[PDB]
Structure 1
Amino acid sequence: ALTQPASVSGSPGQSITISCTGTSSDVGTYDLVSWYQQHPGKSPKLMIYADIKRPSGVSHRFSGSKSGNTASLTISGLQSADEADYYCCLYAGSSTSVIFGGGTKVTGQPKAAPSVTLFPPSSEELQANKATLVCLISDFYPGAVTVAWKADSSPVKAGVETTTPSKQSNNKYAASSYLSLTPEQWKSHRSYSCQVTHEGSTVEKTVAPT
Structure 2
Amino acid sequence: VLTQPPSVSAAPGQKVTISCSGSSSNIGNDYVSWYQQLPGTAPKLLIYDNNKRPSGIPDRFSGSKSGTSATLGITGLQTGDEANYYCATWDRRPTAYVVFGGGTKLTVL
TM-score (norm 1): 0.49
Matches within 5 A, 1:162-181: none
Structure 2 Cα separation of the partners of residues 54 and 12 of structure 1: 23
Match of 1:38 in 2: 37
Change (3 A) 1:43 1:68: same
Match of 2:53 in 1: 54
- Tell me the SS of whatever aligns to 2:14: coil
Q: Deviations over 1:3-59 (max 9, x none)?
A: 00100111111110000211123322x140100000111110000111100012212
Q: Deviations over 1:73-93 (max 9, x none)?
A: 110111111100000011146
Deviation of the 1:2 alpha carbon: 0.4
Instruction: Flag the structure with more relative contact order, 1 or 2, with Cα contacts below 8 A and sequence separation at least 6.
Output: 2
Structure (1/2) with the larger helix percentage? 1
Deviation of the 1:61 alpha carbon: 1.0
Match of 2:108 in 1: 108
Q: Which runs of 5+ in 1 are unaligned?
A: 110-210
Structure 1 outlier segments of 4+, above 6 Å: none
Match of 1:166 in 2: none
Aligned residues between the structures: 108
Aligned letter for 1:54? R
Change (3 A) 1:91 1:20: same
Q: Identical aligned pairs, as a percentage?
A: 61
Contact 2:30 2:89 in 1 (8 A): no
Q: Which runs of 5+ in 2 are unaligned?
A: none
Aligned letter for 2:58? S
TM-score (norm 2): 0.91
Structure 1 Cα separation of the partners of residues 59 and 23 of structure 2: 29
Contact 1:80 1:107 in 2 (8 A): no
Contact 1:2 1:20 in 2 (8 A): yes
- Tell me the SS of whatever aligns to 2:97: coil
Contact 2:30 2:90 in 1 (8 A): no
Larger Rg, first or second structure (1 or 2)? 1
